[PDB]
Amino acid sequence: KPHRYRPGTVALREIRRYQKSTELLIRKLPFQRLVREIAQDFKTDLRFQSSAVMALQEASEAYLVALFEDTNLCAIHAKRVTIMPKDIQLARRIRGER
C-alpha cells in the first residue's frame, strides 16, 4: 500500500500553510451569488462594484477566521481538539451577537 500520513500531521501542515497565505479562501463567484441572494430580499435589481464584493469577502473571511479562533479556544477549553456548534454558540454568546 502507498504512503499515508497521520491526521494530526496534515492537519497541522494545513494550519501552517493557510496561516502563512493571504489569498481569499472562499471562492469569488459563489460568494458574489450569496451576496446578491441576500441583497435580493432588500431591493430588487441591485448592482455591485467589484471592489464592494471584494471588501465584503475580505471582511467576511476575517470575521469567520476570528470566529474560528474563538471557537478553537472554546474547544481547547472544553478539553477537546474538535470544534462544535456548542463552541460557536459559546463564542458568539460571549462576544455578544446572540
Binding site: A11, R27, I38, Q49, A55, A59, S60, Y63, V65, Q89
Partner: protein, 83 residues
C-alpha cells in the same frame, strides 16, 4: 431570476480553509451548516446596512465605500478601500 440556495456555495473545503487560518485542527460535521448560518446572519447585517447607505445616496449600485462605512459603523473597520 430570483437567486436561491446560494448559501451552499460556501462549500465545505472553503469552511475548512477558513478553519485552518483560524488554527483549527479538527472540525465536526455540523460546523459547516452552523458556519453557513453565522456567515449568512453577518452578511444579512452588513449588506442590510450597505443597502441602506445606497438607498440614502439616491443610487442603485452598492459601492465599496458603502460597505466600508457599514463595517466601520458596526465596529469592524476595514482598511484597503477608503474610509
Amino acid at each position: 431570476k430570483v437567486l436561491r440556495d446560494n448559501i451552499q456555495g460556501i462549500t465545505k473545503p472553503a469552511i475548512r480553509r477558513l478553519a485552518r487560518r483560524g488554527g483549527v485542527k479538527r472540525i465536526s460535521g455540523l460546523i459547516y451548516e452552523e458556519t453557513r448560518g453565522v456567515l449568512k446572519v453577518f452578511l444579512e447585517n452588513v449588506i442590510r446596512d450597505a443597502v441602506t447607505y445606497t438607498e440614502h445616496a439616491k443610487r442603485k449600485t452598492v459601492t465599496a465605500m458603502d460597505v466600508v462605512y457599514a463595517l466601520k459603523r458596526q465596529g469592524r473597520t476595514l482598511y484597503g478601500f477608503g474610509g
